[PDB]
Short mmCIF file of C-alpha atoms and ligand atoms in Angstrom, two decimals:
data_model
loop_
_atom_site.label_atom_id
_atom_site.label_comp_id
_atom_site.label_asym_id
_atom_site.label_seq_id
_atom_site.Cartn_x
_atom_site.Cartn_y
_atom_site.Cartn_z
CA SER A 1 93.04 132.00 150.62
CA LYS A 2 91.46 132.89 147.16
CA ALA A 3 88.70 130.38 145.70
CA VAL A 4 87.23 130.38 142.22
CA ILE A 5 84.70 128.07 140.65
CA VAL A 6 85.57 126.67 137.19
CA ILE A 7 82.70 125.05 135.04
CA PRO A 8 83.80 123.07 132.00
CA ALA A 9 81.20 123.33 129.38
CA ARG A 10 81.77 121.69 126.00
CA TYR A 11 79.08 121.58 123.44
CA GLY A 12 79.93 118.56 121.45
CA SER A 13 78.15 115.53 123.02
CA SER A 14 76.98 112.33 121.41
CA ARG A 15 73.41 111.79 122.99
CA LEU A 16 72.90 115.68 123.46
CA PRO A 17 74.48 117.82 120.75
CA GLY A 18 74.68 121.50 122.25
CA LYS A 19 73.88 120.03 126.14
CA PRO A 20 74.85 123.17 127.87
CA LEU A 21 72.65 125.40 125.67
CA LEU A 22 69.42 123.32 126.37
CA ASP A 23 66.58 124.84 127.66
CA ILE A 24 65.25 124.35 131.33
CA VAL A 25 62.41 126.89 132.48
CA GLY A 26 63.51 129.38 130.08
CA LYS A 27 67.30 129.55 130.63
CA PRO A 28 70.23 127.54 128.99
CA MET A 29 71.48 124.76 131.32
CA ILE A 30 74.85 126.25 131.70
CA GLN A 31 72.94 129.40 133.15
CA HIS A 32 71.54 127.32 135.64
CA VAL A 33 74.61 126.18 137.01
CA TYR A 34 76.28 129.75 136.73
CA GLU A 35 73.64 131.10 138.73
CA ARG A 36 73.86 128.80 141.80
CA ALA A 37 77.68 128.95 141.45
CA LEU A 38 77.20 132.59 142.16
CA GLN A 39 75.36 131.72 145.68
CA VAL A 40 78.50 130.07 147.12
CA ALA A 41 80.03 132.01 149.98
CA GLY A 42 83.59 132.51 149.80
CA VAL A 43 84.18 132.38 146.19
CA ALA A 44 85.72 135.41 144.52
CA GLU A 45 85.11 134.67 140.81
CA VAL A 46 83.21 131.92 138.55
CA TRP A 47 84.30 131.00 135.16
CA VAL A 48 83.01 128.93 132.40
CA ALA A 49 86.00 126.97 130.62
CA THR A 50 84.91 126.16 127.01
CA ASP A 51 85.94 124.97 123.70
CA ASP A 52 83.28 126.24 121.78
CA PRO A 53 82.73 129.56 120.64
CA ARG A 54 78.90 129.40 120.50
CA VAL A 55 79.21 128.48 124.22
CA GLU A 56 81.47 131.03 124.95
CA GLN A 57 78.80 133.62 123.25
CA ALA A 58 75.73 132.12 125.33
CA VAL A 59 77.67 132.88 128.47
CA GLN A 60 78.57 136.14 127.77
CA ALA A 61 75.03 136.97 126.34
CA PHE A 62 73.90 136.60 130.21
CA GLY A 63 76.88 138.54 131.62
CA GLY A 64 79.28 135.25 132.47
CA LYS A 65 82.92 135.26 132.58
CA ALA A 66 83.98 132.77 129.96
CA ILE A 67 87.63 131.62 128.87
CA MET A 68 88.53 129.74 125.76
CA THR A 69 90.43 126.46 126.17
CA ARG A 70 92.10 124.11 123.67
CA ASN A 71 89.68 121.28 122.22
CA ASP A 72 92.55 118.72 121.99
CA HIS A 73 92.31 118.12 125.76
CA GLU A 74 91.84 114.50 126.37
CA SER A 75 90.57 115.00 129.93
CA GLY A 76 88.45 117.50 131.73
CA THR A 77 91.20 118.01 134.52
CA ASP A 78 93.72 119.22 131.90
CA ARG A 79 91.35 121.65 130.79
CA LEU A 80 91.34 123.09 134.43
CA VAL A 81 94.93 122.90 134.48
CA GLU A 82 95.19 125.46 131.54
CA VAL A 83 92.76 127.82 133.06
CA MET A 84 94.79 127.68 136.16
CA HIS A 85 97.92 129.55 134.33
CA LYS A 86 95.52 132.15 133.75
CA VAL A 87 93.27 132.78 136.40
CA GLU A 88 95.09 132.57 139.80
CA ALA A 89 93.55 131.09 142.91
CA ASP A 90 94.70 129.06 145.70
CA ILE A 91 92.00 126.59 145.48
CA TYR A 92 90.09 125.83 142.26
CA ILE A 93 86.60 124.23 142.30
CA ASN A 94 85.58 122.02 139.42
CA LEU A 95 81.61 121.77 138.78
CA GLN A 96 80.01 120.29 136.07
CA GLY A 97 78.08 122.05 133.48
CA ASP A 98 75.44 119.47 133.14
CA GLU A 99 74.13 119.33 136.72
CA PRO A 100 71.85 122.22 137.16
CA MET A 101 70.45 121.03 140.24
CA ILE A 102 73.62 121.73 142.09
CA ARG A 103 73.04 122.82 145.97
CA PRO A 104 75.23 125.86 146.97
CA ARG A 105 75.59 124.58 150.27
CA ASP A 106 77.28 121.25 149.30
CA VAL A 107 79.97 123.36 147.26
CA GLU A 108 80.47 125.24 150.74
CA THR A 109 81.01 122.04 152.57
CA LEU A 110 83.58 121.32 150.30
CA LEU A 111 85.60 124.51 150.22
CA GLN A 112 84.97 124.83 154.16
CA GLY A 113 87.01 121.22 154.32
CA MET A 114 89.53 122.54 152.02
CA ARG A 115 90.15 125.51 154.48
CA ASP A 116 89.82 123.77 157.82
CA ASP A 117 92.89 121.42 156.65
CA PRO A 118 95.69 123.28 154.73
CA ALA A 119 97.35 120.27 153.80
CA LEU A 120 94.79 118.55 152.08
CA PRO A 121 95.53 118.50 148.47
CA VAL A 122 92.27 117.36 146.89
CA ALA A 123 88.55 116.91 148.07
CA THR A 124 85.52 115.57 146.92
CA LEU A 125 81.74 114.64 147.41
CA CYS A 126 79.69 111.24 147.94
CA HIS A 127 76.21 110.45 149.23
CA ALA A 128 74.60 106.94 150.34
CA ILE A 129 73.23 104.64 148.13
CA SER A 130 71.47 101.59 148.32
CA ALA A 131 73.01 98.18 147.17
CA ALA A 132 70.76 97.94 143.88
CA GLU A 133 72.05 101.35 142.74
CA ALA A 134 75.82 100.47 143.73
CA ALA A 135 75.57 97.35 141.34
CA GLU A 136 75.55 99.94 138.33
CA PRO A 137 78.88 100.08 136.52
CA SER A 138 77.96 103.72 135.28
CA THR A 139 77.79 104.70 138.91
CA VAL A 140 81.15 105.07 140.58
CA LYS A 141 81.34 104.09 144.30
CA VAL A 142 83.93 104.91 147.02
CA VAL A 143 85.36 103.55 150.25
CA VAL A 144 86.83 105.73 153.04
CA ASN A 145 88.71 105.43 156.12
CA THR A 146 87.99 107.15 159.50
CA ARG A 147 89.41 110.47 158.52
CA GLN A 148 87.11 110.23 155.14
CA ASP A 149 89.97 109.86 153.11
CA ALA A 150 89.21 107.59 150.05
CA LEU A 151 90.86 103.94 150.03
CA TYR A 152 89.68 103.42 146.20
CA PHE A 153 87.00 104.48 143.35
CA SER A 154 85.59 101.63 141.37
CA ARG A 155 82.69 100.91 139.34
CA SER A 156 82.56 97.49 141.00
CA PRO A 157 80.62 97.22 143.95
CA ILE A 158 82.75 97.98 146.90
CA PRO A 159 82.90 96.99 149.51
CA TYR A 160 81.94 93.26 148.45
CA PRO A 161 78.75 92.19 149.87
CA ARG A 162 80.07 89.12 151.71
CA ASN A 163 77.93 89.82 154.60
CA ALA A 164 75.48 91.89 152.83
CA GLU A 165 73.44 93.39 155.83
CA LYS A 166 76.57 94.84 156.74
CA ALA A 167 77.69 96.77 153.52
CA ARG A 168 76.76 100.65 153.11
CA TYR A 169 77.51 102.20 149.61
CA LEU A 170 78.70 105.61 148.85
CA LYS A 171 78.14 107.21 145.40
CA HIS A 172 80.71 109.34 144.18
CA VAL A 173 79.55 112.96 143.38
CA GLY A 174 82.08 114.43 140.60
CA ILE A 175 82.74 117.78 142.16
CA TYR A 176 86.35 118.49 143.18
CA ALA A 177 88.30 121.10 144.76
CA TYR A 178 92.03 121.32 144.24
CA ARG A 179 94.82 123.14 145.91
CA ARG A 180 96.97 125.39 143.19
CA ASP A 181 100.05 123.14 143.57
CA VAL A 182 98.26 119.77 142.71
CA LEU A 183 97.17 121.28 139.44
CA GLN A 184 100.83 122.66 138.72
CA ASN A 185 102.10 119.23 139.13
CA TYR A 186 99.34 117.16 137.51
CA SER A 187 100.63 117.14 133.79
CA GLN A 188 103.73 115.39 134.97
CA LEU A 189 101.68 112.39 136.59
CA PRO A 190 101.60 109.20 134.63
CA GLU A 191 98.30 107.39 133.82
CA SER A 192 98.11 104.55 136.39
CA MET A 193 96.74 100.92 135.26
CA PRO A 194 93.67 101.11 137.65
CA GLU A 195 92.81 104.35 135.79
CA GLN A 196 93.14 102.99 132.41
CA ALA A 197 91.37 100.05 133.38
CA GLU A 198 88.38 101.55 135.28
CA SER A 199 88.34 104.61 132.95
CA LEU A 200 88.38 107.01 136.14
CA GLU A 201 90.60 109.71 135.99
CA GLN A 202 90.71 110.53 139.57
CA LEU A 203 92.65 107.30 140.21
CA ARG A 204 95.68 109.04 138.47
CA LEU A 205 95.96 111.07 141.61
CA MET A 206 95.74 107.99 144.08
CA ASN A 207 98.60 106.28 141.99
CA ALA A 208 100.71 109.08 142.95
CA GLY A 209 99.84 108.99 146.67
CA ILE A 210 97.73 112.19 146.51
CA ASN A 211 95.28 112.18 149.03
CA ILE A 212 91.57 112.77 148.11
CA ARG A 213 89.09 113.55 151.14
CA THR A 214 85.51 112.65 150.54
CA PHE A 215 82.83 114.70 152.29
CA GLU A 216 79.29 113.07 152.62
CA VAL A 217 76.16 115.03 151.59
CA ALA A 218 72.35 114.12 151.03
CA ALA A 219 71.28 112.66 147.77
CA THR A 220 72.17 114.94 144.87
CA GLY A 221 69.84 115.93 142.30
CA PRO A 222 69.50 113.80 138.78
CA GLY A 223 72.25 115.15 136.50
CA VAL A 224 71.01 115.70 132.88
CA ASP A 225 72.49 113.15 130.92
CA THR A 226 69.18 111.17 129.11
CA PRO A 227 66.28 113.17 127.71
CA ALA A 228 64.40 110.75 130.28
CA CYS A 229 66.39 112.59 133.30
CA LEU A 230 66.00 115.99 131.34
CA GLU A 231 62.39 116.06 131.66
CA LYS A 232 62.35 115.22 135.20
CA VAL A 233 65.03 117.97 136.03
CA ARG A 234 62.43 120.51 133.87
CA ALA A 235 59.58 119.70 136.18
CA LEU A 236 61.66 119.20 139.44
CA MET A 237 63.29 122.43 138.51
CA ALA A 238 59.86 124.08 137.77
CA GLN A 239 58.39 122.38 140.87
CA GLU A 240 60.98 124.48 142.76
CA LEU A 241 60.04 127.80 141.26
CA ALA A 242 56.38 127.69 142.61
CA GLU A 243 57.42 126.37 146.12
CA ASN A 244 60.17 129.44 146.58
CA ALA A 245 57.38 132.11 145.56
CA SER B 1 116.53 95.15 164.14
CA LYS B 2 115.21 91.69 165.63
CA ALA B 3 113.03 89.67 163.60
CA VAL B 4 110.98 86.73 164.63
CA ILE B 5 108.40 84.27 162.78
CA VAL B 6 105.46 83.30 164.66
CA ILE B 7 103.09 80.35 162.98
CA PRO B 8 99.38 80.33 164.33
CA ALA B 9 98.43 76.69 164.31
CA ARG B 10 95.14 75.89 166.05
CA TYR B 11 94.01 72.39 166.46
CA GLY B 12 90.49 73.08 165.07
CA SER B 13 88.92 73.05 161.62
CA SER B 14 85.57 72.87 160.50
CA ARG B 15 86.64 70.57 157.59
CA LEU B 16 89.71 69.31 158.81
CA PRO B 17 90.08 68.76 162.65
CA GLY B 18 93.76 68.64 163.96
CA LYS B 19 94.90 70.11 160.71
CA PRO B 20 98.41 71.04 161.64
CA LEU B 21 98.99 67.42 162.61
CA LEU B 22 98.05 65.71 159.30
CA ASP B 23 100.49 63.89 157.76
CA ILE B 24 102.05 65.09 154.44
CA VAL B 25 104.79 62.73 153.06
CA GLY B 26 106.17 61.75 156.44
CA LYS B 27 105.67 64.71 158.51
CA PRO B 28 102.70 66.74 160.07
CA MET B 29 101.92 69.86 158.22
CA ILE B 30 103.20 72.08 160.87
CA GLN B 31 106.88 70.53 160.61
CA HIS B 32 106.86 71.40 157.23
CA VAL B 33 106.21 75.29 157.68
CA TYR B 34 108.39 75.20 160.54
CA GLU B 35 111.27 73.67 158.87
CA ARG B 36 110.87 76.05 155.98
CA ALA B 37 110.61 79.20 158.34
CA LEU B 38 114.03 78.08 159.74
CA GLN B 39 115.68 78.55 156.12
CA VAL B 40 114.81 82.22 156.17
CA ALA B 41 117.88 84.44 156.25
CA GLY B 42 117.77 87.21 159.02
CA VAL B 43 115.18 85.83 161.55
CA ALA B 44 116.08 85.34 165.10
CA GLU B 45 113.59 82.78 166.38
CA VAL B 46 110.71 80.71 165.04
CA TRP B 47 107.67 80.07 167.08
CA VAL B 48 104.43 78.25 166.53
CA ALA B 49 101.73 79.56 168.44
CA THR B 50 99.20 77.10 169.28
CA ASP B 51 96.16 76.56 171.58
CA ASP B 52 96.13 72.76 171.83
CA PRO B 53 98.57 70.40 174.05
CA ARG B 54 98.53 67.73 171.43
CA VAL B 55 99.98 70.36 169.06
CA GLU B 56 102.55 71.64 171.32
CA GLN B 57 103.97 68.17 172.20
CA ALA B 58 103.92 67.47 168.29
CA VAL B 59 106.25 70.50 167.68
CA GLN B 60 108.68 69.76 170.55
CA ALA B 61 109.09 66.19 169.46
CA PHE B 62 110.68 67.39 166.18
CA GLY B 63 112.84 69.99 168.02
CA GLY B 64 110.81 73.02 167.43
CA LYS B 65 109.57 75.99 169.74
CA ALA B 66 105.98 76.20 170.97
CA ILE B 67 104.18 78.53 172.96
CA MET B 68 100.54 78.05 174.28
CA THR B 69 98.01 80.65 173.38
CA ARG B 70 94.29 81.48 174.28
CA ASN B 71 91.57 79.24 172.97
CA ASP B 72 89.09 82.27 172.54
CA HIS B 73 90.93 84.04 169.48
CA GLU B 74 88.99 84.29 166.63
CA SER B 75 91.86 85.41 164.38
CA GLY B 76 95.75 84.80 163.77
CA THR B 77 96.21 88.16 164.10
CA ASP B 78 94.87 88.33 167.89
CA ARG B 79 96.79 85.44 168.58
CA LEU B 80 99.97 87.20 167.29
CA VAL B 81 98.99 90.05 169.65
CA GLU B 82 99.44 87.63 172.60
CA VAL B 83 102.60 86.35 171.44
CA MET B 84 103.88 89.86 171.15
CA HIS B 85 103.83 90.30 174.86
CA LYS B 86 105.86 87.27 175.46
CA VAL B 87 108.45 87.05 172.80
CA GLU B 88 110.06 90.45 172.34
CA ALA B 89 111.11 91.55 168.56
CA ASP B 90 110.92 94.84 166.49
CA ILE B 91 109.32 93.10 163.43
CA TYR B 92 106.83 89.97 163.77
CA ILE B 93 106.07 87.72 160.58
CA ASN B 94 102.72 85.81 160.62
CA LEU B 95 103.09 82.52 158.55
CA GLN B 96 100.05 80.52 158.12
CA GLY B 97 100.22 77.17 159.61
CA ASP B 98 98.51 75.53 156.64
CA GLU B 99 100.71 76.61 153.84
CA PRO B 100 103.52 73.78 153.99
CA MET B 101 104.65 75.04 150.15
CA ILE B 102 105.85 78.45 151.60
CA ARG B 103 109.20 79.59 149.61
CA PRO B 104 111.53 80.86 152.25
CA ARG B 105 112.82 83.35 149.68
CA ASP B 106 109.39 85.10 149.43
CA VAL B 107 109.45 85.71 153.14
CA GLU B 108 112.93 87.24 153.15
CA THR B 109 111.65 89.54 150.25
CA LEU B 110 108.94 90.52 152.83
CA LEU B 111 111.65 91.06 155.71
CA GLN B 112 114.07 93.17 153.43
CA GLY B 113 111.16 95.26 152.36
CA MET B 114 110.72 96.22 156.21
CA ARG B 115 114.39 96.66 156.70
CA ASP B 116 114.65 98.97 153.79
CA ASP B 117 112.08 101.30 155.16
CA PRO B 118 112.00 101.77 159.03
CA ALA B 119 108.67 103.84 158.84
CA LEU B 120 106.61 100.98 157.13
CA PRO B 121 104.23 99.66 159.70
CA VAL B 122 102.97 96.65 157.88
CA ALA B 123 104.17 94.56 154.67
CA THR B 124 102.29 91.81 152.77
CA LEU B 125 102.56 89.76 149.61
CA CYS B 126 100.78 89.50 146.30
CA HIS B 127 101.19 87.62 142.86
CA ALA B 128 99.74 87.92 139.25
CA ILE B 129 96.22 86.21 138.52
CA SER B 130 94.24 86.01 135.38
CA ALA B 131 90.75 87.92 135.12
CA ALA B 132 89.06 84.37 135.39
CA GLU B 133 90.59 83.96 138.87
CA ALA B 134 89.78 87.53 139.89
CA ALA B 135 86.16 87.14 139.39
CA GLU B 136 86.02 84.56 142.52
CA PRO B 137 84.76 85.92 145.80
CA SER B 138 87.07 83.41 147.41
CA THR B 139 90.21 84.88 145.94
CA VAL B 140 91.08 88.31 147.70
CA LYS B 141 92.20 91.05 145.25
CA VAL B 142 94.40 93.92 145.66
CA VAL B 143 95.14 97.40 143.91
CA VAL B 144 98.43 99.36 144.62
CA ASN B 145 100.06 102.62 143.80
CA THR B 146 103.63 103.35 142.27
CA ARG B 147 104.99 102.64 145.63
CA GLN B 148 103.15 99.56 145.97
CA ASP B 149 101.09 100.63 148.70
CA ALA B 150 97.66 98.98 148.93
CA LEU B 151 94.84 101.17 147.67
CA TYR B 152 92.37 98.64 149.03
CA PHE B 153 91.53 94.99 149.16
CA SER B 154 88.19 93.17 147.90
CA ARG B 155 86.64 90.05 146.92
CA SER B 156 85.20 92.06 143.90
CA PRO B 157 87.19 92.16 140.83
CA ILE B 158 89.36 95.11 141.28
CA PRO B 159 90.04 97.10 138.98
CA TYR B 160 87.04 97.00 137.28
CA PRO B 161 87.52 96.06 133.54
CA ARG B 162 85.69 98.80 131.46
CA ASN B 163 88.70 98.47 129.35
CA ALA B 164 89.60 94.79 129.79
CA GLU B 165 92.84 94.49 128.12
CA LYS B 166 94.11 97.16 130.33
CA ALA B 167 93.21 95.52 133.51
CA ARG B 168 95.89 93.38 135.58
CA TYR B 169 94.86 91.79 138.52
CA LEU B 170 96.71 90.67 141.83
CA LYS B 171 96.08 88.13 144.34
CA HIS B 172 96.58 88.80 147.89
CA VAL B 173 98.98 86.20 149.67
CA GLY B 174 98.22 86.12 153.42
CA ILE B 175 101.61 86.74 154.83
CA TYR B 176 102.26 89.66 156.91
CA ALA B 177 105.15 91.39 158.50
CA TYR B 178 104.26 93.90 161.40
CA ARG B 179 106.36 96.33 163.24
CA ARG B 180 106.12 95.86 167.02
CA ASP B 181 104.33 99.26 167.74
CA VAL B 182 101.39 98.17 165.31
CA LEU B 183 100.65 95.12 167.29
CA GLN B 184 100.96 96.92 170.77
CA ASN B 185 98.17 99.38 169.33
CA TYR B 186 95.83 96.67 167.46
CA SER B 187 93.57 96.14 170.23
CA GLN B 188 92.51 99.41 170.31
CA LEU B 189 91.47 99.79 166.75
CA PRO B 190 87.68 99.41 166.19
CA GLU B 191 86.24 97.19 163.77
CA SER B 192 85.28 98.62 160.29
CA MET B 193 82.28 98.52 157.93
CA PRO B 194 84.27 97.36 154.94
CA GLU B 195 86.03 94.70 157.09
CA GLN B 196 82.46 93.66 158.48
CA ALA B 197 81.16 93.39 154.91
CA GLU B 198 84.25 91.95 152.91
CA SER B 199 84.88 89.99 156.19
CA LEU B 200 88.78 90.96 155.58
CA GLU B 201 90.55 91.50 158.53
CA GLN B 202 93.41 93.57 157.10
CA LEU B 203 90.60 96.30 156.09
CA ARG B 204 90.56 97.42 159.69
CA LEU B 205 94.24 98.61 159.22
CA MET B 206 93.49 100.54 156.17
CA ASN B 207 90.46 102.16 157.98
CA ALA B 208 92.85 103.30 160.62
CA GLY B 209 95.19 104.79 158.20
CA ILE B 210 98.01 102.22 158.64
CA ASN B 211 99.96 101.92 155.37
CA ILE B 212 100.45 98.36 154.14
CA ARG B 213 103.17 97.96 151.30
CA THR B 214 102.46 95.00 149.10
CA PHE B 215 105.40 93.11 147.44
CA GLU B 216 105.15 91.00 144.39
CA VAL B 217 106.25 87.39 144.16
CA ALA B 218 105.80 84.51 141.69
CA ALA B 219 102.27 82.49 141.76
CA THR B 220 102.15 80.46 145.18
CA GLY B 221 101.32 76.97 146.15
CA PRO B 222 97.97 76.12 147.55
CA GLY B 223 96.86 76.01 151.12
CA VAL B 224 95.09 73.11 153.07
CA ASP B 225 91.72 73.88 154.07
CA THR B 226 89.52 71.30 152.28
CA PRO B 227 90.37 67.43 152.22
CA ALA B 228 90.60 68.00 148.62
CA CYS B 229 93.47 70.23 148.66
CA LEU B 230 95.20 68.18 151.15
CA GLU B 231 95.47 65.32 148.70
CA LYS B 232 96.52 67.99 145.89
CA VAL B 233 99.34 69.11 148.38
CA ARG B 234 100.75 65.50 149.01
CA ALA B 235 100.88 65.02 145.46
CA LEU B 236 102.77 68.33 144.81
CA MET B 237 105.17 67.64 147.59
CA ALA B 238 106.00 63.93 146.36
CA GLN B 239 107.05 64.79 143.21
CA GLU B 240 109.11 67.96 144.71
CA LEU B 241 111.32 65.10 145.95
C1 LIG C 301 97.74 83.09 153.87
C2 LIG C 301 96.58 82.44 153.86
O1 LIG C 301 95.93 82.47 152.71
N1 LIG C 301 96.12 81.67 155.25
C3 LIG C 301 94.92 80.77 155.05
C4 LIG C 301 95.07 79.61 154.97
C5 LIG C 301 96.19 78.92 154.21
O2 LIG C 301 97.40 79.70 154.27
C6 LIG C 301 95.21 78.66 152.68
O3 LIG C 301 95.02 77.57 152.52
C7 LIG C 301 96.54 79.08 151.56
O4 LIG C 301 95.77 79.50 150.25
O5 LIG C 301 93.94 78.62 154.97
C8 LIG C 301 92.96 79.28 155.87
O6 LIG C 301 93.09 78.88 157.22
P1 LIG C 301 92.50 79.18 158.75
O7 LIG C 301 91.16 79.32 158.74
O8 LIG C 301 92.81 77.82 159.63
O9 LIG C 301 93.17 80.52 159.48
C9 LIG C 301 94.56 80.62 159.34
C10 LIG C 301 95.63 80.72 160.26
O10 LIG C 301 95.45 81.37 161.21
C11 LIG C 301 95.23 80.53 162.61
N2 LIG C 301 94.11 80.86 163.41
C12 LIG C 301 92.76 80.74 162.76
C13 LIG C 301 91.63 81.07 163.59
C14 LIG C 301 91.84 81.19 165.11
N3 LIG C 301 90.70 81.65 165.70
N4 LIG C 301 93.10 81.33 165.65
C15 LIG C 301 94.16 81.24 164.56
O11 LIG C 301 95.34 81.00 165.17
C16 LIG C 301 95.07 78.91 161.83
O12 LIG C 301 95.86 78.02 162.73
C17 LIG C 301 95.70 79.28 160.58
O13 LIG C 301 97.25 78.70 160.38
C18 LIG C 301 91.48 78.50 155.66
O14 LIG C 301 91.10 78.56 154.33
O15 LIG C 301 91.28 77.53 156.59
C19 LIG C 301 92.59 80.67 155.69
C20 LIG C 301 93.82 81.69 156.15
O16 LIG C 301 93.46 82.98 155.47
#
């Protein structure tokens, strides 16, 4: 069971031009993700999927494996489908190029889940959040069953707080593990109405009846999206260097 | 493939004591549901499951069939489980005793769905509602996949309208069809967190991985829970004559 980690890293960003190349304690952000991806036990290779030559250069510059992909890709999953044809593996893990604080152990939890059940097509992560955080549309919530299979994903607060004290929210962490056959059949799947409404790509899989198991982990580090969170990451990353000295 | 219709009709109600016996244009509400239930092709028997003698005798008076059930049940579903032990069938349809405007056709759509797919455990109904109606916590929304299987049931507006013009809403109509084996195992299912939070009993089935297919029908008529709706239903059923 060969498994590879793919890291989509596109330069063009609205509120942060050249986001993967931003410096964090002396290294480009993309490098931090790559370095952490390398610490994940059970992974054969680690690739960075990109559509910008500057990003490709920066990755090769530190000895990382880069693979150019089309720029006309509407979704980040289509990008993984293109990489799938060239890079062979049984399990593909999609890490986000803008989360430098990813814990290698969480990705191993994901990978182990995929290996413990050969019939599981897709797997993802989630963690507990308060009711106040769950109210944010920018935050994606998820509800699971006893087998931890996802029932639905939404920007709306679910479950609804009818009996407020009984509600427990789970924030969806955008890291996925896909079986090879799911990616082979992906481009044939049509866009669902909930997907287009919520603007959540993962609902395309649920429309087709593809099961997505969601594993719970502790609260994840703050992902870099705003310069306010960027400084917190820089200081939180630097605080980590001096603690492990 | 034997199918029977069960109509839960408890005497009590916080806003309308003795609700099933309330007169709607000449007949008690329960009689309207029972008569319409008898018009559903494919059903072998129709029973009113009640907890009060005054309701039982009222049903027997007009010719219907009634069965006494315990008074400590908190849900119409639990009451149905008690009936399943006395009345044998392969498929049980649970109609609400306070919806006298039920269309016999919609129940047949439900029954046909169950018969076309022997592997389907539970089936229910739904209809389209505007985005405005979807915002109400009292209106239970549902989202389905291509095979029309329910993804989730919620009082929250789902799907979330990030792209408003793309969102389409579905209101859940509380009529169910259960395969016998589902009822035999019901008492063993544990209450779920989403069930307790949303206060929606059907989420107990989804928590267990039991598939619920939702068939779409046209907008249904109002039920009788408040004395405001009772006057509305009397008005609607008077002009329907
Ligand atoms: C399908 C549905 O929506 N049912 C709801 C009904 C009515 O159909 C609606 O007004 C239509 O929009 O109204 C409510 O009825 P009840 O609270 O009485 O409960 C449903 C049903 O189950 C029986 N029952 C209830 C409680 C207990 N402990 N045991 C029972 O056996 C009742 O007799 C009734 O027939 C309402 O608003 O009050 C809610 C229903 O979900």
